[PDB]
């Protein structure tokens, strides 16, 4: 992709005691037009891994096909081995870098959340092959609004509970709905724990507009 | 960079500066701008540092292959020709490499100038790099084919020291070699600013 078409905005993610939670609105914008207000930008990879994507939706749908088929292929072997969140993150870095190096990128920024062998995984990959791990992630415009709030809480309390992480993510989605002109008040929250990957939605934040009288 | 080489009664003198620049920043104060291919073959380097180092080391590997294949060293004309063809193969690609292939073969002392365009000139005096004009002025003024070894070493060290004073992209040390019938000798590696201070103190 040289020019993205239908694009998705910020994807959030935060590690908690016992898993990871990611959040993303259900909007596909065509420039400023909120063209598709009901599309899922989150994907269950396997029982340990989940993925959310900012950027071009068509490029995300392609990656979702390629990733989904890799998981089917692996499950046909039934040999006791399965892709860890960290291996999916690693594959995606190579895949993005390879496309970047051919001057035909997959126009996305992604957040991979995982839970394997008692450890929480949170990783970022961009369209150039820039990848890393952190206790919290926020793509797109969320890197400017949501990440300062995720980091502010994680400074005071480095290890959050599943409920503490969830309330913080819900507060971030509200700030993003107010300040990001390419967002929508319809989102999903996906959680990965020992039990597996659960995607909840469609969700909405209770807005307040009392400042209109100040 | 400033590189110079001249043939004289006692062989070939070859001198280089040692500065590397990333724009206006001096990225290295002392780099070796001479490759020693064998005891009878040297290459001065100017232009893009990576191009110089890779292509001159590729010429060195080809010279080494020639010795293994023929039990004899390559001639200065054939080595300079090999490098010239490497440059022609990549013309228009944006390589930047000026070099002087200096040696002693069955035809006596040899000195060739080779460009990234494929230019290949035999001659008895050349100078390459951003400071080449300053080196030419000094070298031309004090040159005689009958210079003694010490008189030639003074001319080489002075042309490079004076080029480093006027050219902002030249500086560091002068690395000078003397190519004799029985092979080259590294004459000296002298701080160019100490030489300039010494010249000034004699005024």
């Amino acid at each position: 992709t040289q020019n993205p078409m239908v694009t998705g905005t910020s994807v959030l993610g935060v590690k908690f005691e016992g898993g990871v939670v990611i959040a993303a609105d259900m909007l596909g914008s065509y420039g400023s037009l909120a063209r598709f207000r009901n599309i899922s930008r989150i994907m269950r990879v396997n029982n340990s891994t989940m993925l959310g994507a900012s950027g071009d939706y068509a490029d995300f749908q392609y990656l979702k096909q390629v990733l989904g088929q890799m998981v089917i292929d692996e499950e046909l072997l039934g040999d006791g081995h399965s892709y860890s969140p960290r291996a999916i993150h690693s594959w995606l870095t190579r895949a993005m870098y390879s496309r970047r190096s051919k001057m035909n990128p997959l126009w996305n920024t992604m957040v991979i959340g995982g839970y394997a062998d008692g450890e929480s995984f949170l990783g970022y990959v961009d369209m150039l092959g820039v990848a890393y791990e952190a206790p919290s992630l926020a793509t797109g415009y969320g890197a400017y609004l949501a990440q300062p709030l995720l980091r502010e809480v994680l400074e005071k309390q480095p290890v959050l509970s599943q409920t503490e992480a969830r309330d913080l993510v819900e507060r971030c989605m509200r700030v993003l709905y107010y300040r990001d002109a390419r967002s929508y008040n319809r989102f999903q929250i996906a959680t990965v724990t020992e039990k597996g990957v659960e995607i909840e939605g469609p969700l909405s934040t209770e807005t307040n507009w009392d400042i209109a009288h100040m | 960079t400033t590189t110079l080489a001249f043939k004289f009664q006692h062989g070939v003198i070859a001198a280089v500066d040692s500065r590397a620049s990333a724009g206006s920043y001096i990225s290295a104060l002392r780099v070796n701008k001479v490759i020693e291919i064998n005891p009878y073959l040297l290459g001065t380097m100017s232009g893009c540092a990576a191009d110089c180092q890779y292509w001159e080391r590729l010429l060195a590997k080809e010279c080494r292959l020639y010795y293994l294949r023929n039990g004899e060293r390559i001639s200065v004309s054939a080595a300079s020709k090999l490098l010239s063809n490497m440059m022609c193969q990549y013309r228009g690609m944006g390589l930047s490499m000026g070099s002087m292939i200096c040696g002693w073969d069955k035809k006596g002392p040899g000195l060739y100038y080779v460009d990234e365009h494929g230019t290949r000139l035999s001659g008895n005096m050349f100078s390459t790099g951003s400071g080449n004009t300053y080196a030419y002025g000094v070298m031309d003024s004090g040159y005689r084919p009958n210079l003694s070894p010490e008189e030639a070493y003074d001319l080489g060290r002075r042309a490079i020291a004076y080029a480093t004073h006027r050219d902002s992209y030249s500086g560091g040390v002068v690395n000078m070699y003397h190519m004799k019938e029985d092979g080259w000798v590294k004459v000296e590696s002298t701080d160019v600013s100490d030489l300039l201070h010494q010249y000034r103190e004699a005024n």
Partner: protein, 204 residues
């Protein structure tokens, strides 16, 4: 770049009851050195000096136009200018050309003509002033000077300690800059005297 056409480095450093001001001495046009004794530090009073790096023509115009306004000021006021007032005067001068500026970034160093307390400051090309209690730098080697200054500077240096700090910060900074150098000149400004020294520096 316009600022790198001639090059050069200027720095000021605060001490205990004294200030220092230093500059390189090169005058060059791109890679060609023309002169090795170019004046970049100009006295604006007995204990007040301005250091100007950048485009050579504008270093000379700004120093001359500043001297003009200063002479008229001390004649009308019947007093020597205060360091902070000379800073405001340079700011006004530079900001008057906000949309076609002089390519120079001044550095001011002095002692108050009444309070004798050290003053150091710098201004950008459009006259934004910046006062500091340690050092100010301007030139084509500002990163090199910031590294040297940040590491070598200490709070209450005596004139001789300050002289060694500013000298080593300038020498080592300009020796990693292709278009700065050809010598370094240092001025140490004390209540009782001005010490001017040229250093034995690299000439390449």
């Amino acid at each position: 770049s316009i600022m790198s056409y001639n090059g050069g480095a200027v720095m000021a450093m605060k001490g205990k009851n004294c200030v220092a001001i230093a500059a390189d001495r090169r005058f060059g046009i791109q890679a060609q050195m023309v002169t090795t004794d170019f004046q970049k530090i100009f006295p604006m009073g007995d204990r007040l000096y301005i250091g100007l790096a950048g485009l050579a023509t504008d270093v000379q115009t700004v120093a001359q136009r500043l001297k003009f306004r200063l002479n008229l000021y001390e004649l009308k006021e019947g007093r020597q200018i205060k360091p902070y007032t000379l800073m405001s005067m340079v700011a006004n001068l530079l900001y008057e050309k906000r949309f076609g500026p002089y390519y120079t970034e001044p550095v001011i160093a002095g002692l108050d003509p009444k309070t004798f307390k050290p003053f150091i400051c710098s201004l950008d090309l459009i006259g934004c002033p910046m006062v500091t209690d340690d050092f100010v730098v301007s030139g084509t080697c500002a990163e090199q000077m910031y590294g040297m200054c940040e590491s070598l500077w200490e709070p209450n240096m005596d004139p001789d300690h300050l002289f060694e700090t500013i000298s080593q910060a300038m020498l080592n900074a300009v020796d990693r800059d292709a278009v700065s150098g050809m010598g370094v000149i240092v001025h140490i400004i004390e209540k009782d005297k001005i010490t001017t020294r040229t250093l034995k520096a690299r000439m390449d």
